[PDB]
Design a protein around this ligand. Structure first.
Ligand code: MG
Ligand code: MG
Ligand code: MG
Ligand code: MG
Ligand code: MG
Lengths: 206, 150, 129, 81, 184, 87
RNA sequence: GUCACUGGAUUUCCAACGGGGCCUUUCCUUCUGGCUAACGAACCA
């Protein structure tokens, strides 16, 4: 059901390798073994970016079809993933959460951070696990940016990236935002790249 | 697991899935059966025979290519021994241990193992007695069996 | 040492369904595994299964659809008088209206509904539901 | 995991598995053909052979046994099968 | 040589093949001295899904090792001399019935001489070269069965075209159903 | 569950897990239903039209919600060359 | 037919379910009998 236009394209495979997403974790994991392509010498595992890409598309496919675009919740408590998920929130409806998730957000209707999303997106399942876990109490699906070593528990449809840091987290969120805008939305002819620089999603700090 | 110890070891031969073959060998079984009986008259057991054949001569396994397992062959040619080489070695060990127990009576571990060995022997002999490879009595005896190895 | 080998089969099956697996490797195989698997298939409690040939006792790989709660063996295999089959089905089956006690009779391995219709009895074998 | 082809596992993981743990068990041992240059005679030795093998004559050597594959001695040629 | 190489005086095809045998017996460095001891019991005709008909030659048993030394040669010239036919050699094996309180016989009954050993010998003769490297059996969700025979990779040319034939050879004999596959 | 004359009793019939084909209980709160958008040619996902899956809490608990999506998506023609039926 | 009890299936529905026979390499052996082969290969009850 996926047209040949949806195929990888060399432009995108450039951004990913430039962003170094394909570089994977040394300790792999049993559930993340399919996303491995091959291991480098000196113990560095090469993620299969075509599987990276296709998942990203399937992920962006599910963000889409959520009837109200604000319900989709992008969560990062990591610094690298913070300015990323704010931008994803600005383009797509997507009410975000950066830094502290605070517990009792999906449970505990009396709290001020209360949400009832119909989807959750998570940069790091390890660091964000509070959100994944609460998610599992309310029947909420979850998208996850995962490395090779990441908790698979209560996460549907993971996107293998890098997630140790640098540009990969920014890219996968950038590309995520790009593809949900092409799907439904208005971008309309994915043939042409994006006006928006991918460096808008990134970590800042000084 | 192990009978007389706690060992769970699985170390064993995996016999290939083949009835026939190796497609390459084609050395004409009566040619190997000849080599079988030669080593038989040379004073070898079926066990060390099929190893010598497997190491130097090819001969993956003699049940294949000759249609008959090694011991059976020695019997049809009449080289079959009195007590099976099964038993022969157990009684060999048992006698070899008891000789050690005679000069050292203070070795209790030796006294322990001799029990284990002779237990194995009476079980084995019962079997061979049931299927009538041994006479209806037989019954390994500690004093007498020293000559049964020699 | 192995004793039943049916009881190892229905165990690996019942263990796998519960862990959510869709397929199970059985070993060894035997005519009674086959016949049991057969009465289980023909009511739909498993998918198809495929015997493997190793030159010794065989293996089996069975495909599990879910929908099976427990498949289990009764050891020892008790002689079951014909009226007692009612009494067996009451104990170990979840309701009168479904589930199967499976016997072994001179008329062949079957379930108790068949044996009821064929008016036959013998040693009980296991259950499935 | 949770659904897989047991009837057709990959030949990469079936090769790394233990001898008896293959879908159907089978030996990992091979056989050789060996000549020393001093005789034209061919001798076929089993890879793991426990007996120190000589060719038909001359008592050179062929292999010496170990806990693993027999060790072929010095210069010799060995083909497979 | 015409009627003697037959043994049981009929029939049409067998005499036809008999004259195709002796014809090949004309060359005698080898192709005569080797072919003469090997006679056969009889033959059967069986259709295939393709328009080509299958010719299955029955063989006496222990002679079966003689037809094996030739085989390739003999089935090459027989498929030459009779074109449009697939030629295969099957040994005729006695099947004794499973003893019971009703069908029972003295002298035990050997393993070979059992229905399953014979049907497991048919699969071995039908393919004749290219030893079987495995087997399966599919137990289908509707209650039927399919033997999957796994053939070797060497010299599988000598068979490749006849695989839909062997199948229908087996089905008219046994009542069972076959499939084949190759290693990789 | 039918009754005496052909009639539908049993006030409700639960969903079934797509991976396990196990009933999804009303109190199963780790259970998840996934809605994937259907596309017309060149993007533009169709609103109101989904290819949907339902997973049981057990599977999402066990860590298999990911690999079971893949096997399902490829089967239902979502992905290609991701999931592998042999290992 | 009385406005739950009862009489029958028009070989056609559909369906299941169970029983007995045969055929396929296959009911072995014996005893009695029937007919027959050039003294009782066969075959049948
Ligand atoms: Mg690094
Ligand atoms: Mg063990
Ligand atoms: Mg012990
Ligand atoms: Mg003990
Ligand atoms: Mg069904």
């Amino acid at each position: 059901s996926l047209p040949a236009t949806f195929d990888l394209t060399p432009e995108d495979a450039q951004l990913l390798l430039a962003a170094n997403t394909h570089l994977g974790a040394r300790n792999v994991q049993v559930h993340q073994e399919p996303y491995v392509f091959n291991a480098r010498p000196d113990g560095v595992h090469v993620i299969n970016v075509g599987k990276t890409w296709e998942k990203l598309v399937l992920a962006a496919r599910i963000i889409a079809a959520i009837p109200n675009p604000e319900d989709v919740v992008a969560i990062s408590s990591r610094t690298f993933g913070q300015r990323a998920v704010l931008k994803f929130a600005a383009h797509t409806g997507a009410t975000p959460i950066a830094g502290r998730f605070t517990p009792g957000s999906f449970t505990n209707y009396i709290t001020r951070s209360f949400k009832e999303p119909r989807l959750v997106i998570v940069t790091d399942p390890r660091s964000d696990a509070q959100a994944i876990k609460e998610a599992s109490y309310v029947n909420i699906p979850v998208i996850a940016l995962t490395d090779l070593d990441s908790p698979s528990e209560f996460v549907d449809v993971a996107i293998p990236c890098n997630n140790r840091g640098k540009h990969s987290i920014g890219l996968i969120w950038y590309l995520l935002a790009r593809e949900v805008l092409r799907l439904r939305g208005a971008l309309v002819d994915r043939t042409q790249p994006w006006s928006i620089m991918p460096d808008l999603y990134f970590y800042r700090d000084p | 697991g192990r009978m007389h110890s706690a060992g769970k070891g699985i170390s064993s031969s995996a016999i290939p899935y083949s009835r026939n073959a190796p497609a390459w060998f084609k050395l004409s079984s009566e040619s190997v059966i000849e080599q079988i009986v030669k080593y038989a008259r040379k004073g070898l057991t079926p066990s060390q025979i099929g190893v010598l054949l497997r190491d130097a001569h090819g001969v993956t396994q003699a049940r294949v290519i000759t249609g008959n397992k090694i011991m059976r062959i020695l019997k049809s040619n009449g080289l079959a021994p009195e007590i099976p080489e099964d038993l022969y070695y157990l009684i060999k060990k048992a006698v070899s241990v008891r000789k050690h127990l005679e000069r050292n009576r203070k070795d209790k571990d030796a006294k322990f193992r001799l029990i284990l060995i002779e237990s194995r022997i009476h079980r084995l002999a019962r079997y061979y007695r049931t299927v009538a490879v041994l006479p209806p009595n037989w019954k390994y005896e500690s004093a007498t069996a020293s000559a049964l190895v020699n | 040492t192995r004793s039943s080998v049916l009881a190892d089969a229905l165990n690996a099956i019942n263990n796998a369904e519960k862990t959510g697996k869709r397929q199970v490797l059985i070993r060894p195989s035997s005519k009674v595994i086959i016949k049991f698997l057969q009465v289980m298939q023909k009511h739909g409690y498993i998918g198809e299964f495929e015997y493997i040939d190793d030159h010794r006792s065989g293996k089996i790989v069975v495909q599990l659809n879910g929908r099976l709660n427990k498949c289990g063996v009764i050891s020892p295999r008790f002689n079951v008088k014909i009226g007692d089959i009612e009494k067996w089905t009451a104990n170990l089956l979840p309701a009168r209206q479904f589930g199967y006690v499976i016997l072994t009779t001179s008329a062949g391995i079957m379930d108790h509904e068949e044996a009821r219709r064929k008016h036959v009895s013998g040693k009980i074998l296991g259950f499935v539901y | 995991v949770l659904v897989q082809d047991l009837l057709h596992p990959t030949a990469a993981s079936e090769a790394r598995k233990h001898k008896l743990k293959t879908l159907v068990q089978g030996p990992r041992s091979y056989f050789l053909d060996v000549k020393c240059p001093g005789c034209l005679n061919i001798t076929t030795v089993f890879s793991h052979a426990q007996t120190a093998v000589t060719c038909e004559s001359c008592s050179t050597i062929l292999c010496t046994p170990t806990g693993g594959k027999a060790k072929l001695s010095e210069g010799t040629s060995f083909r497979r099968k | 040589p015409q009627a003697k190489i037959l043994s049981q005086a009929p029939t049409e095809l067998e005499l036809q093949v008999a004259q195709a045998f002796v014809e090949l017996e004309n060359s005698s460095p080898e192709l005569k001295a080797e072919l003469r001891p090997l006679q056969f019991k009889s033959i059967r005709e069986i259709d295939v899904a393709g328009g080509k008909k299958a010719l299955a030659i029955f063989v006496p048993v222990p002679s079966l090792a003689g037809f094996h030394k030739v085989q390739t040669k003999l089935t090459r010239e027989l498929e030459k001399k009779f074109q449009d036919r697939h030629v295969i050699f099957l040994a005729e094996r006695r099947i004794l019935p499973k003893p019971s309180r009703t069908s029972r016989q003295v002298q035990k009954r050997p393993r070979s001489r059992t229905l399953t050993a014979v049907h497991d010998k048919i699969l071995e003769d039908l393919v004749f070269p290219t030893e079987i490297v495995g087997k399966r059996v599919r137990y289908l969700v509707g209650g039927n069965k399919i033997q999957k025979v796994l053939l070797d990779s060497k010299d599988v040319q000598q068979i490749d075209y006849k695989l839909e034939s062997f199948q229908a050879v087996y089905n008219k004999l046994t009542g069972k159903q076959i499939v084949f596959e190759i290693p990789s | 569950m039918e009754n005496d004359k052909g009639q539908l009793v049993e006030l409700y019939v639960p969903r079934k897990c797509s991976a396990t084909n196990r009933i999804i209980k009303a109190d199963d709160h780790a259970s998840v239903q996934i809605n994937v958008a259907k596309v017309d040619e060149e993007g533009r996902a169709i609103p109101g039209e989904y290819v949907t899956y339902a997973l049981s809490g057990y599977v999402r608990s066990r860590g298999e919600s990911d690999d079971s999506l893949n096997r399902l998506a490829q089967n239902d023609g979502l992905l290609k060359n991701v999931w592998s039926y042999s290992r």
